[PDB]
Design a protein around this ligand. Structure first.
Ligand SMILES: [Mg+2]
Ligand SMILES: [Mg+2]
Length: 87
RNA sequence: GGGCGUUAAGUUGCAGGGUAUAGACCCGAAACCCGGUGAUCUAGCCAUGGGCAGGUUGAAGGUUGGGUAACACUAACUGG
């Protein structure tokens, strides 16, 4: 992804606006790339070698978001509402 | 020599028998051809109007809920 977009992402979700490694930040970067890449997998439908990378991104987002749900329930609920994931 | 001939009355009427061509002693076909009349029944078509009580199951979809990274997928209701 582009450097201005990731700088936007860490500025809108960051702890100290430098850290780039927090769980909210990693889920925000993952969801930005997933909702950008759905447009690729709507026009190219036989693109399985990148569809696997999308499935990796999905599973990794789900692992981080489950760790957030175990860690802070209030932070997880406000984060899933701020992003716009369903569950 | 043989074949055909010679010495033997025809012709015009009228009546009659027969013949010929005409329908030819009468009645009787399926049929063929030429010219018209018919699509007020029926076959199809075109244009234009009309008719089909009632009562059933309940397809496509559409909402909502769940599910899916998003669909696909699924239950409830609506649908007709
Ligand atoms: Mg990665
Ligand atoms: Mg007529």
């Amino acid at each position: 992804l582009s450097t201005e977009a990731t700088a936007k992402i860490v500025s809108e979700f960051g702890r100290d606006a430098n850290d780039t490694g927090s769980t909210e930040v990693q889920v925000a970067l993952l969801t930005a790339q997933i909702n950008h890449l759905q447009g690729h997998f709507a026009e190219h439908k036989k693109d399985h070698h990148s569809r696997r990378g999308l499935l990796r991104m999905v599973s990794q987002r789900r692992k981080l978001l489950d760790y957030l749900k175990r860690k802070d329930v209030a932070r997880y609920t406000q984060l899933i509402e701020r992003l716009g994931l369903r569950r």
